[PDB]
Design a protein around this motif. Structure first.
Motif, PDB file in Angstrom:
ATOM      1  N   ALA A   1      47.371  62.828  50.531  1.00  0.00           N
ATOM      2  CA  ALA A   1      46.020  62.757  51.042  1.00  0.00           C
ATOM      3  C   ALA A   1      45.420  61.314  51.394  1.00  0.00           C
ATOM      4  N   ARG A   2      45.692  60.598  50.542  1.00  0.00           N
ATOM      5  CA  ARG A   2      45.219  58.987  50.858  1.00  0.00           C
ATOM      6  C   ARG A   2      45.637  58.517  52.207  1.00  0.00           C
ATOM      7  N   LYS A   3      46.626  59.075  52.856  1.00  0.00           N
ATOM      8  CA  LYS A   3      47.287  58.743  53.993  1.00  0.00           C
ATOM      9  C   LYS A   3      46.567  59.612  55.167  1.00  0.00           C
ATOM     10  N   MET A   4      46.005  60.615  54.932  1.00  0.00           N
ATOM     11  CA  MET A   4      45.495  61.626  56.070  1.00  0.00           C
ATOM     12  C   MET A   4      44.146  61.143  56.381  1.00  0.00           C
ATOM     13  N   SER A   5      43.841  61.411  57.746  1.00  0.00           N
ATOM     14  CA  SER A   5      42.804  61.045  58.386  1.00  0.00           C
ATOM     15  C   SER A   5      41.581  62.084  57.987  1.00  0.00           C
ATOM     16  N   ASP A   6      40.389  61.960  58.401  1.00  0.00           N
ATOM     17  CA  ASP A   6      39.362  62.831  58.050  1.00  0.00           C
ATOM     18  C   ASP A   6      39.525  64.037  58.713  1.00  0.00           C
ATOM     19  N   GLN A   7      39.971  63.841  60.149  1.00  0.00           N
ATOM     20  CA  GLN A   7      40.151  64.823  60.892  1.00  0.00           C
ATOM     21  C   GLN A   7      41.295  65.752  60.320  1.00  0.00           C
TER      22      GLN A   7
END
Length: 131
Positions: A114-120
């Motif tokens: 999740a640290r690499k995921m965007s808000d979208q």
């Protein structure tokens, strides 16, 4: 550190019971979020879920409980009860329907980066569950 996402002192079973009761009452699913304060992906997921767009999505659709798993050494039986969501990495989620039965668990480390995921990307993940 101030304002940690996980409460290391919480009685997680009581909290889950209380959230499931609220879901039954409101006819909403409950989102169980397993993680820990040391985990940078867990901290990132929490920060994203805190934003205005994502808060509104989650608040409208779910009752929510955060379950501290420590260094993979706390609340492990609560993970086991709900389908071992953490064995595949943290953060991990379980969606329990309003009747108390599990609908979905992350079993492939879906949120483990999740640290690499965007808000979208985070929005889309939770929005799919609400479809």
């Amino acid at each position: 550190a101030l304002n940690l996402p996980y409460d290391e002192h919480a009685d997680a079973w009581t909290q889950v019971k209380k959230a499931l009761a609220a879901g039954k009452r409101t006819h909403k699913p409950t989102l169980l979020v397993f993680g820990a304060n040391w985990c940078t992906d867990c901290r990132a997921l929490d920060k994203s879920l805190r934003n205005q767009k994502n808060t509104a999505l989650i608040a409208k659709h779910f009752e929510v409980v955060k379950i501290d798993v420590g260094n993979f050494d706390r609340n492990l039986e609560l993970s086991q009860a709900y389908g071992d969501p953490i064995q595949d990495g943290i953060p991990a989620v379980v969606v329990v329907n309003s009747d108390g039965k599990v609908r979905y668990t992350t079993k492939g480390g879906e949120l483990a980066n999740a640290r690499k995921m965007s808000d979208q990307g985070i929005y889309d993940f939770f929005a799919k569950i609400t479809e």
